Amino acid sequence: ALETVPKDLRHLRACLLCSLVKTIDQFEYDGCDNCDAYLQMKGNREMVYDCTSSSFDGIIAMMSPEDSWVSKWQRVSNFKPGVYAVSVTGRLPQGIVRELKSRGVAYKSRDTAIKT
């Protein structure tokens, strides 16, 4: 859709669950399109700045997650097509990861980048 594409290249971040790359306005006005019932980052900025971080690199134009090699390698085949990242560094605090396991969402480290 037209909502998953970042409007402006300035002030864009990437989530740590599905690696959604969008502008800071879309994460506040709409939020995470791939997870809205477990995260609830629409309507505020503290939650947007808590889970989603600016420290990320790599951009991919995901269009057909059901048939693509890069989608399977990043385990983003069950997500919505759109702007994604290949290495989103960081870790969630111990305040939102405990509820995801009780709700059946396995938070996986999307940082596929190597350290030294």
């Binding site: 690199d57 995901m62 693509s68 090699w69 890069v70 989608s71 290495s87």
Partner: protein
């Protein structure tokens, strides 16, 4: 398994190229002339050319036709072997972490190793830990 192709781009317009072709795809996915691309890779460490995913070489030529940012490398589309689909996604150590060690580019303490203390959430300025090297206003006039 879809194939990966390499196209040449303008130097300094990689993210613009990606954000333009994604909007082209969304603007032509419902017409009679859709795009056969799966995804376009634009690494941040590279500068000068990008990558595109398509099964055959005709699809990329029929998809990148009409864009002024990919008109130069339009007459040739190289192909990488199957073992280079993995080395593209590798990133070596974003780059924003507190209590780390960074260096300056401009100012007086050029190429001097420093330390980070606090990060402003506004993405405007960043705190730094350095040591002054001034004379305390004794030598200079």
């Amino acid at each position: 398994d879809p194939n990966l192709w390499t196209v040449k781009c303008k130097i300094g317009e990689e993210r613009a190229t990606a954000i333009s072709l994604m909007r082209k795809f969304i603007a032509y996915q419902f017409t009679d002339t859709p795009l056969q691309i799966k995804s376009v890779v634009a690494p941040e460490h590279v500068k000068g050319y990008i990558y595109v995913e398509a099964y055959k070489q005709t699809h990329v030529k029929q998809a990148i036709e009409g864009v002024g940012n990919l008109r130069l490398g339009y007459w040739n589309q190289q192909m990488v072997p199957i073992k280079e689909m993995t080395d593209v996604l590798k990133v070596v150590k974003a780059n924003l972490k507190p209590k780390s060690w960074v260096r300056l580019k401009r100012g007086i303490y050029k190429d001097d190793i420093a330390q980070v203390d606090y990060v402003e959430p506004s993405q405007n300025t960043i705190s730094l830990k350095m040591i002054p090297r001034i004379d305390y206003d004794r030598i200079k006039a």
